[PDB]
C-alpha cells in the first residue's frame, strides 16, 4: 500500500514522450520531464508523476515552427538571416521574417518578427525592390 506501488510506463503526449527514453518499470511517486519528437514543442506540464502505480497525462504538443517555404521564400520574403527559407524552428522561438532587401511590406501583410507556435507565424508578403 505505502511501500508497494511501483508505476509502469509513463503515458506520452500528442506525439510526445519523456525527454530520455520510455521506461517500462518506473519508481513510485517519481516524476520526469517530457518533450515532443522533432521540432515539436509541447505546453503545459511536461513534468508528469505516477501515483499508486498510475501515471498522469503529459501536456500538449504544439506543431513546430514549420511555415510555408513556397510562399515566404517565394514572392520576396525570408528570415532575419536571409539564407533561403530558414523558416523552421522549435515552437517557442522567435522567427523574424524579412521583406527581401528591396521589397516593402504590401500593407495587407501580417508581421515580420513574431513567435512560431502550433505551426503559425503570420507570414507577410512585402513588395518593391
For residue 34, CA distances in Å to 10, 26, 76, 95, 119 come to: 10, 15, 38, 24, 20
Hey, how many other C-beta atoms are within 10 angstroms of the C-beta on 49? 15
Backbone angles phi, psi at 14, to 5 degrees: -65, 90
Locate cell 511555415: which residue? 67
Nearest residue to 11 via CA among 44, 50, 62, 39: 50
Quick one: 64-129 is in which CATH superfamily? Complement Module, domain 1 (2.10.70.10)
Distance separating alpha carbons of residues 88 and 68, to the nearest angstrom: 9
Contacts of 50 by beta carbon, 8 Å cutoff, 6+ apart: 7, 8, 10, 26, 28, 29, 30, 31, 56
How many residues are listed for the chain in this entry? 129
Residue 48: how many other CB atoms lie within 10 Å: 20
Cite the residue boundaries of each domain of the chain with CATH code 2.10.70.10. 14-63, 64-129
Q: Are 96 and 110 in contact (CB under 8 A)?
A: no
Pick the CATH number of 14-63 from 2.10.70.10, 3.30.1490.20, 3.30.70.100, 3.50.50.60: 2.10.70.10
If we measure between CA atoms, which residue out of 92, 107, 94, 101 comes closest to residue 129? 101
**CA angle centred on 95, ends 118 and 101, rounded to 5°:** 140
Amino acid at each position: 500500500e505505502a511501500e508497494f506501488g511501483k508505476c509502469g510506463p509513463p503515458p506520452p503526449i500528442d506525439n510526445g514522450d519523456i525527454t530520455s527514453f520510455p521506461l517500462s518499470v518506473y519508481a513510485p511517486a517519481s516524476s520526469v520531464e517530457y518533450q515532443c519528437q522533432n521540432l515539436y514543442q509541447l505546453e503545459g506540464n511536461k513534468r508528469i508523476t505516477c501515483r499508486n502505480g498510475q501515471w498522469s497525462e503529459p501536456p500538449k504538443c504544439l506543431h513546430p515552427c514549420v511555415i510555408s517555404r513556397e510562399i515566404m521564400e517565394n514572392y520576396n520574403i525570408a528570415l532575419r538571416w536571409t539564407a533561403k527559407q530558414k523558416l523552421y524552428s522549435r515552437t517557442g522561438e522567435s522567427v523574424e521574417f524579412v521583406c527581401k532587401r528591396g521589397y516593402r511590406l504590401s500593407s495587407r501583410s501580417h508581421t515580420l518578427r513574431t513567435t512560431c507556435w502550433d505551426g503559425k507565424l503570420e507570414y507577410p508578403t512585402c513588395a518593391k525592390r
